[PDB]
């Protein structure tokens, strides 16, 4: 089960050798190994669905719009899309650098190591894009698109940092607006906007002519994160392949915030005294408070209403290839159990 | 005088950014963006941005169009935008206090989100400024590289500083010298000292990859500049500085606090835990008195004399006499300064 995905995976190794044995940025033999270890720990491995969606999207935009000379994707076409797909995976790798880190005094030294790891990787994307796109017309537009998503990611990463730290001293810091900003800037941009926007820039398109699609993808990114959060609570761990830890891990879950908005005083103090522990006695009291607040129903309500909104906004787009791409994104997420 | 010729450049750029066809904005959003813009970028001495133009002027002399000054000033004002973004988060602990100056925490992420999003707005101006005014030059890509380097180095430092300032409220042992050095270097040294000279240099038609030694000097000189800052906030003629030192009350990660924790023993360590990040002058004085007892006034004289001599030596070892002149100018205006 790999096909063009196997053809995609190889590109990481090509970019990695380029980045390491680059004359413009020399490296000690010890520097190279140190950088390569950071690269391999952080960037390859995983589902790769974000980077691949760049290639899958570029393939669907070409298949439908065309007006190019042939509809089959060139080997050089597949490769360049994969280079952007892997740039996406680098952006992603940087965004997650901090997600462990979690007593307190050991935290800034620990955090310092992680920050420098991402510093190394962040300085890779400009070089990747320059090596492989410096000559195209759209190069400057591509640098913009990446600068925007890169900068929005860093903002979301900083808020998630402030927020996950402030959550250890007071759960009331987790709020609905803050959750939406973290989800939007830290995740939605690279996850849903960035792939397709990459396919469009190399397809020879201007992004300022797709603001209606950019709002759709960003909202679809929020919807996707509300899904993950919900699944981490209850969703057949044998289907997901993972045990839910968000309630234990003291995460800023869509569930937790919707809880503290609807539940009051007595229910609120129940949550402070039971959220984020490791024995199931408190984990179940939480899961029961969510059931008491009907949060499975509030979620399923949110799901159908948001799906209707986006399908409407999608059916209302002028670009049939774009909407065909967004329709595949939305149906691949809808009511997914995994 | 040339300062007045430099300041209007801000208004030039501010007018460009707002009434950009490529970036439409409501009249009501434009006021909001302008309020963010001028609250954060102009005002203050503007010395970093000015050092770009003075540096270009000294480099050119030792090897002048009005438009030249404009472009140099455009880069100097670019520096001020970077400086602005680095500092957006610095009073995040005192603006979350919607009380007096008491613990908060729940109101902290809302406060931070505002700040983060302000700096996000200002961070998107530098690429537009550099493109508008340099898209066409030989060195344009060298400029985009240079600003991406410092921009990213700045971003790392504030992220570490954030982690550090938060973890410093709970458990004081979080403040350490390696963490202090990293923050000082990545958050500050890059934009303040490297970036100005590097701007004057790349526009002067130079490649930065052949100035690694000058860069190492400038970054270290930036760290030296911050250790001076920290030391003065404790004892440095509060009447001369024109400001009252607030660092001990504010529970800041000072070079001094770090050096104290290194030298002091468990009794002195507890004196520091039980005082320090408090308000009353009685507890603040126990610290400033503990600093004296640990000999941190002389330890500072050692760092300064050694860093000054060490850098003077490294600078004189540069082949480029024009570069040596600029770094010597920076070093001698920082040296033993009382304000």
Residue numbers in the entry:
A (entry chain B): 1 to 102, 113 to 348
B (entry chain A): 3 to 65, 73 to 348
Paper passage:
Prenyltransferases, also known as isoprenyl diphosphate synthases, catalyze the sequential condensation of a basic five-carbon building block (C5), the isopentenyl diphosphate (IPP), to synthesize prenyl precursors of isoprenoid metabolites and isoprene polymers, collectively called polyisoprene. Ultrahigh molecular weight cis-1,4-polyisoprene and trans-1,4-polyisoprene (TPI), which are the principal components of natural rubber and gutta-percha, respectively, are also isoprenoid metabolites that are assumed to be synthesized by specialized prenyltransferases. To investigate the molecular properties of the EuTPT proteins, we determined the three-dimensional structures of EuTPT3 and EuFPS1 using X-ray crystallography. Similar to EuFPS1 and other prenyltransferases, the EuTPT3 subunits were composed of 10 core helices (α1-α10) with a deep pocket that included two DDxxD motifs responsible for substrates binding.
All dimers observed in the two crystal forms were superimposable with a root-mean-square deviation (RMSD) range of 0.797–0.941 Å over 595–633 aligned Cα atoms. The superimposition parameters suggested that the dimeric architecture of EuTPS3 was highly conserved and unlikely to be caused by crystal packing. Among the structural elements involved in substrate binding and catalytic activity, EuTPT3 featured two conserved DDxxD motifs at the active site, both of which could contribute to substrate recognition. EuTPT3 also featured structurally conserved basic residues (Lys46, Arg50, Arg109, and Lys348) in the equivalent positions.
